[PDB]
Design an enzyme around this catalytic site. Structure first.
Site, PDB file in Angstrom:
ATOM      1  N   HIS A  13     103.824  36.483  28.542  1.00 44.41           N
ATOM      2  CA  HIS A  13     104.443  37.811  28.062  1.00 44.41           C
ATOM      3  C   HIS A  13     105.121  37.720  26.653  1.00 44.41           C
ATOM      4  CE1 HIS A  13     104.267  39.645  31.824  1.00 44.41           C
ATOM      5  NE2 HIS A  13     105.165  38.709  32.400  1.00 44.41           N
ATOM      6  N   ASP A  36      97.791  35.427  36.687  1.00 40.42           N
ATOM      7  CA  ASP A  36      99.017  35.819  37.132  1.00 40.42           C
ATOM      8  C   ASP A  36      99.287  37.298  37.384  1.00 40.42           C
ATOM      9  OD1 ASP A  36     101.692  36.898  36.259  1.00 40.42           O
ATOM     10  OD2 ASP A  36     102.034  34.592  36.328  1.00 40.42           O
ATOM     11  N   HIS A  90     101.146  39.556  36.958  1.00 41.67           N
ATOM     12  CA  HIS A  90     101.610  40.436  35.850  1.00 41.67           C
ATOM     13  C   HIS A  90     100.540  40.367  34.906  1.00 41.67           C
ATOM     14  CE1 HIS A  90     105.081  39.328  38.034  1.00 41.67           C
ATOM     15  NE2 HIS A  90     105.292  40.632  38.154  1.00 41.67           N
ATOM     16  N   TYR A 133     106.641  32.093  42.109  1.00 42.42           N
ATOM     17  CA  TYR A 133     107.964  31.571  42.291  1.00 42.42           C
ATOM     18  C   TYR A 133     108.274  31.283  43.587  1.00 42.42           C
ATOM     19  CZ  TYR A 133     107.772  34.001  37.895  1.00 42.42           C
ATOM     20  OH  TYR A 133     107.715  34.255  36.687  1.00 42.42           O
TER      21      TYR A 133
END
Ligand SMILES: CCCCC(=O)N(CCCC)Cc1ccc(C(=O)NO)cc1
Ligand SMILES: [K+]
Ligand SMILES: [K+]
Ligand SMILES: [Zn+2]
Length: 358
Positions: free
Chosen positions: A134, A172, A174, A305
């Site tokens: 990000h 990932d 995202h 996570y």
């Protein structure tokens, strides 16, 4: 006999959230993944690659001096200033060790890419945090300070030749907005991301992640977004996207090095993902990517996570890198309806650029 590298350094655990010790981007993400590699006897099979700090000059491969400076200055900040600075970004917490940890994540990946390119190892896995994808040229975002994967592509080019063809596959859950933007005009670095999208209702919440953002300028065709619009996406959908999109385009691009922004937050039981890709699924994706670039593949932890899910899933990727046979995977479950629409949309958008697409 091919050699797999592994880099892990417990100092990267020092980056922590001083105001919520349970924040999901936990120090114990990397220690749990490491301990599972030991338990499964994967670590002993790997060539251990040392961690190092990235230098400021290396960070400048992708990041503005102003961005490097502000994060560097956090190393000496009082707690109240660390809290204020982190709140200036979207979803960032900062401790006095965060800058050093972000440097270690990137330098670990640089040493791993160097090991691959100079032939010391065939492929490698980097158990690193904080994540990277990000991060933008000029800003931290989404638990990420510097864009480890983007930096590693540029570092790879710096130690070989400027036009070294790098594929970054970002699985990932995202969108790696930072990776896309850094290379949006670049035809030397092919960026393919798969991500939950929901018409922008999923972090990082921007239409930049949709399938019609195909790159800019000479970079047109070299940005491939595969956006999901449902939920409970899993092995069937990821296998199909690889079959129809990722592997055909990658083969046509013919990368010389493959970097994986390997978040494991599309795995079962992740509150930040909502998907159900299995460890066996990740194994099959890893094994498909090993078919590229004479096997020169570097697996870079991003998000993910659920401590058990990321430890099982990343360990299965290392197993594939080490040459173990891919596990039995179901190939018969029908896709979720939306996933067929997503794949069809990307195919239509990328038909002009990739002659092998069907
Ligand atoms: C609060 C809005 C709903 C959750 C959200 O959008 N969040 C979570 C904030 C703290 C958990 C920002 C976020 C999420 C995931 C990642 C990541 O995993 N990227 O790869 C990065 C940033
Ligand atoms: K992604
Ligand atoms: K690109
Ligand atoms: Zn993520």
């Amino acid at each position: 006999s091919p050699i797999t590298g592994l880099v892990y350094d417990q100092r990267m655990m020092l980056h922590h959230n001083m105001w919520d010790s349970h924040h999901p981007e936990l120090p114990q993400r990397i220690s749990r993944i490491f301990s599972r590699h030991e338990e499964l006897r994967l670590l002993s099979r790997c060539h251990r690659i040392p961690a190092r700090l990235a230098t400021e000059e290396e960070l400048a491969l992708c990041h503005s001096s102003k961005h490097i400076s502000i994060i560097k200055s956090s190393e000496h900040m009082k707690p109240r200033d660390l809290n204020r600075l982190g709140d200036e970004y979207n979803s960032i917490f900062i401790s006095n060790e965060s800058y050093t940890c972000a440097l270690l994540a990137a330098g670990s990946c640089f040493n791993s890419a160097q090991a691959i390119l100079t032939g010391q190892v065939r492929n490698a896995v980097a158990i690193v945090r904080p994540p990277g994808h990000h991060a933008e040229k000029d800003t931290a975002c989404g638990f990420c300070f510097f864009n480890t994967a983007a930096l590693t592509a540029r570092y790879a080019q710096s130690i070989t030749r400027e036009s070294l063809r790098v594929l970054i596959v970002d699985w990932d859950v995202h969108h790696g907005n930072g990776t896309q933007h850094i290379f949006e005009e670049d035809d030397s670095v092919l960026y393919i991301s798969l991500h939950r999208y929901e018409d922008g209702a999923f972090f990082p919440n921007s239409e930049d992640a949709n399938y019609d953002k195909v790159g800019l300028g000479k970079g047109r065709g070299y940005n491939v977004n595969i956006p999901w619009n449902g939920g409970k996406m899993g092995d069937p959908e990821y296998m199909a996207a690889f079959h129809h999109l990722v592997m055909p385009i990658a083969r046509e691009f013919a990368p010389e090095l493959v970097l994986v922004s390997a978040g494991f937050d599309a795995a079962r039981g992740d509150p930040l993902g909502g998907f159900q890709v299995t460890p066996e699924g990740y194994a099959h994706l890893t094994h498909q990517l090993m078919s590229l670039a004479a096997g020169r593949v570097l697996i870079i932890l991003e998000g993910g996570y659920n401590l058990t899910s990321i430890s099982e899933s990343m360990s299965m990727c290392t197993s594939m890198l080490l040459g173990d046979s891919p596990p039995s995977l179901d190939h018969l479950t029908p896709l979720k309806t939306s996933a067929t629409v997503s794949i069809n949309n990307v195919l239509r958008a990328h038909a002009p650029f990739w002659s092998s697409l069907r």
